[PDB]
Amino acid sequence: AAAAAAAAAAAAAAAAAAAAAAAAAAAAAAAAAAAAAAAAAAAAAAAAAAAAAAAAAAAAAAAAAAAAAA
Amino acid sequence: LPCRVDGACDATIIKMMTDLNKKGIKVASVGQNYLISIPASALFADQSPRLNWASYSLLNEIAAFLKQFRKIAITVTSYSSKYVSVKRERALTLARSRVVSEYLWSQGVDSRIIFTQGLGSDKPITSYTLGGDRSPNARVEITFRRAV
Amino acid sequence: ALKETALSVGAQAGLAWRAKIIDEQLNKQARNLDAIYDFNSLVLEHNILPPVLLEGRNTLNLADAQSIRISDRTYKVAKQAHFITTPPTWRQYLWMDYVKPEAPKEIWCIYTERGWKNGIDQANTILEENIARIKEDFGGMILYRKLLAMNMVSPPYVSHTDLGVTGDGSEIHIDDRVLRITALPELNVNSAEWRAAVAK
Amino acid sequence: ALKETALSVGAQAGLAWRAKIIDEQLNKQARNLDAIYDFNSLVLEHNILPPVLLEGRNTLNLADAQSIRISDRTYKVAKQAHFITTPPTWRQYLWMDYVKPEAPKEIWCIYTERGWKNGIDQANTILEENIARIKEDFGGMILYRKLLAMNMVSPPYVSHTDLGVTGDGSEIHIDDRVLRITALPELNVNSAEWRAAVAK
Amino acid sequence: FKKPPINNPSDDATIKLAEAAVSVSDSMLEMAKVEKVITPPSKDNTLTIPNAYNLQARASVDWSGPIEELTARIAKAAHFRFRVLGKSPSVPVLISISTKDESLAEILRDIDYQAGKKASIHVYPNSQVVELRYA
Amino acid sequence: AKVEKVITPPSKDNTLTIPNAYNLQARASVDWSGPIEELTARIAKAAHFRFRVLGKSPSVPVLISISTKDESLAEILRDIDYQAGKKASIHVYPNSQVVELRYAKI
Amino acid sequence: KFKKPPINNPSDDATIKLAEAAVSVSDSMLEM
Amino acid sequence: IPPSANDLLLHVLEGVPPPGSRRLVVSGGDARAWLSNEKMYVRTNLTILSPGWLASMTSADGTHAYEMQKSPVLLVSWHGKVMQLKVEG
Amino acid sequence: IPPSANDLLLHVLEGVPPPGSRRLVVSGGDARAWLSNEKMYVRTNLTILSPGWLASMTSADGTHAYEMQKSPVLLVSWHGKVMQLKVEG
Amino acid sequence: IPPSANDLLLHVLEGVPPPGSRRLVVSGGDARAWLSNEKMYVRTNLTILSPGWLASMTSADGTHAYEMQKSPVLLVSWHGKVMQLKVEG
């Protein structure tokens, strides 16, 4: 975690963790600016998986068939 | 899962920060404004816009130190002591800073802008004016603000 | 039969693995693909997404034994121009879907390798159609800007009905501009005002 | 499944513990929050609680493919001005509820820690919406006092029908003043008498 | 010793992808060259900053609405007279100024700009009058 | 691009309206994909130009995406002006020190 | 040894978002 | 005549959720998202780029509020960086 | 009056399949084939010789798109060489 | 025309409960509270601040009597101190 500066003093929300020297590089909350650039989901960047289906194919909520996840 | 560390650790930040201050590249750390100050003896040849080959290792832990922070704009600005004129001097320091920022975005920064410029001893940090690139005035400085 | 379900085990694992490899292979070229598929500076003056025109040169249809129709060029307006808020990226068109499949002798091993390459090249055909769809859509907008220069289509005619302060006393909107598209971009058949692409 | 009910044991205990910690963390800043959310000296002349105005600048609605509406600013009157007896504190808006839950291996321990942080940040989102609601309500009253200066709303028009001694002989009320609100505070659309916030 | 670039095209397909990237990015630029039409600053039609010492007072405005009221108060904040010439239409011409410190003549510059051609602003600084015409 | 630049000739540049300056001849390298005004505010901050805005910025953002390496700040502002075609324009007044972003009338 | 100057007490999330609300209501207040 | 905006964008221009909602957790960026009736609403100060929104407002301090259809990933610009945000629900 | 062409040849003049299709794998040559409704469509730049096609278009770069009935073998010319392509489906 | 007050505030301006009531115990302050019909009535000489009351009277000696809805906590001022009172029922 916040290693060798000191121990982690606070955990500043809308930020990362706050070490007892400076601001750390370890993310405190879920809602910090963590560099997500590769998602992992069925029918991401179209609309989400329309959950009511029970068949072979996986249909998105924008009515595309997720053929990469069927 | 979301990531805890962003490809960096604080122990490695202060490990590079002690090692750069031991090799004489002085890291000032004010707020989130970070300054690394590099003497122009430690990178280039004298009154030249040309790197030495061994000084890219010095640029290696400069760039691997610049891996560690989330940053928006690095500005790199260079200035040396007087050699012929201020016009020749400002051409030298502009070429000087643009060469070291060309290597720094050849290497890894996650900066969105590197601004890069040179000045004609217009901001000198000591009044003692010994010589050329062996002056402690003759330096490049890499300043940025660490974002969040 | 066990050999067949060994192939079916290998197929979806090869598909998801190939999907993974080309997802960060896409993300390695992320700024390059924003340069290629730059829809952002292809939009029109009132942030209107341009329509996708399709060119087909030198066309024959054999209708029956008695008759053919040739035409020299065919331009089709597909998925007509419309008000876009934020322009499309390449990531709606190119990103294949990553799920991590958690569902698991000698004939099993050789057909899970042939299932593995079947999943790999079937993911390759999905990616090939994704590149095909973005090349259709983007080059259709490019084909508009050719024909908008070349006077074979109309530009869209917007109308901004400006309104002043609007509403009752529980709700006001101060500068209330309603923007409509009246005339859609649309190929003219009155063909004497056309242009021709002569350069030097 | 036992792991799932271990998580569900840890959730409500973490919620109630986080509720406790932020309750006396609120009570440590009790006079500071009376300074921040001072509704008491925001009320009007006849102890009328001011209404909550909502500002939304620079608004688009994409209605369909054919039409958008932009407006530059939107002011909404939400939960209109009314006779308050005693002004609201922050404690109706911010105080989360403390009950002490008296309802109780290795997988149990690790998922009661992940249940414990799930209860902690779910109590944090409840507190975040509580702060959000008081910031809406208070800054809406502040946005009134802006627009009451800035002539975009009416002030409320009270009417005091004074009555003298009132009743039969079994019951008298001596100085019997009936106070009504006739005109509610209300955004004017006749917009030429508006103001503009120019300072130095 | 130095290094190649990290996200370098040092691969025989990624080179063709990135030479295509610089070809479409500059072909995007010469597109933006041919349709981006300017007006010269000799013929820009907008206001120029009228360099009077009352107009270089630092001010602070948050508003949207009908132009005459900001220009009336920007005149009496500037200690200037305010004249109007022309007829205000029934739909008023609506501005939006939101700065929390910016100088006063530049507040007249972006009201002249957000007026555009429905109205415009002249300043005569020797007489100390600002003025708003219609069309 | 070939048929467009022949069927209307580009009449003029934008170096008439963004002229270069000593302290605008500092250089930068930039990848960028956000809205225009925060990038331009950073350009003018490191140019030591006061940055100002004419016109209210529209409801959809004016998005530019500049990806480049080592040119001058004047040509960065020029390519920013171009990639915001007919939605904004950069003006620079170099006898003053002001970079301006002008939004459009629509 | 490297240290930034203000090493205060450990705050918590409640006073973090109370302060973040409090500054915007102070700004709204101020401008009114 | 189109509708003006949604007036519930005034509420999600503040931090307060719409009445009768479902919370959506947002990862990898400073945004809050709620789902009222097959539409999510995002309070952010980032700039959403890819999946397209139906309505938008912006407060005094540059906070925006967006009405959009439910997409499980949001793409924003943070400060010129293209960024991803991930929503569950 | 005959029909003009099929307008879906514009789509298979690009690489994109027709909506509601079945993919056909093509061996022994650079072509892609889809089957929409008892008719296959071939994107190629080769020249199909033996089994006869019902409709054809050609793009700017010499890519052709052919509507034809389903035949399990295609005969093309590649560069004067008579060549065979084999389709499954 | 509104009603005047409740005339049963005259009774709870004295110490006497309303006819047909339920007693409410009050902790942490000098007040007495009764619940007549989904409304509580408080005899105090403190000043109730937070939850808001519907009617009030005051006797000769500064004793007040309040009609209000049933809230399980009362916030008063005692002598400038913000104070809490707790009622069961």
Residue numbers in the entry:
A (entry chain KZ): 1 to 70
B (entry chain KK): 41 to 188
C (entry chain KC), D (entry chain JC): 58 to 161, 173 to 268
E (entry chain KD): 25 to 159
F (entry chain Kd): 56 to 161
G (entry chain Jd): 24 to 55
H (entry chain KH), I (entry chain LH), J (entry chain JH): 273 to 361
Give verbatim excerpts from the published study on this entry.
Using symmetry and focused refinement, we determined a 3.5 Å resolution map of the OMC disk and a 3.7 Å map of the PR. The OMC disk makes up the pinwheel-shaped portion of the T4SS and is organized into a thick central region with 13 arms extending radially outward. The disk is also thin compared to other structurally characterized T4SS OMCs and contains no distinct inner or outer layers. Within the disk, we unambiguously traced and identified DotC, DotD, DotK and DotH along with the protein Lpg0657 (Goodwin et al., 2016; Figure 2B, Figure 2—figure supplements 1 and 2). Notably, rather than an equimolar ratio, the components of the OMC exist at a ratio of 2:1:1:1:1 (DotD:DotC:DotH:DotK:Lpg0657). At the center of the OMC is an elongated fold that is comprised of α-helices and β-strands that we have identified as DotC (residues 58–161 and 173–268). On the peripheral side, DotC makes contact with two copies of DotD, which we have called DotD1 and DotD2. DotK contacts the C-terminal domain of DotD2, whereas Lpg0657 interacts with the N-terminal α-helices of both DotD1 and DotD2. On the periplasmic side of the OMC is another small globular fold that we identified as the C-terminal domain of DotH. Within the OMC disk we traced three poly-alanine chains that could not be unambiguously identified as any component of the Dot/Icm T4SS.
The Type IV Secretion System (T4SS) is a potent weapon used by some bacteria to infect their host and can deliver effector proteins into eukaryotic cells as well as DNA and/or toxins into bacterial neighbors. In the Gram-negative pathogen L. pneumophila, the Dot/Icm T4SS delivers ~300 effector proteins to the cytoplasm of host cells, in some cases causing Legionnaires’ Disease. Central to assembly of the apparatus are five proteins that define the core complex: DotC, DotD, DotF, DotG, and DotH. The map can be divided into two major regions: an outer membrane cap (OMC) and a hollow periplasmic ring (PR).
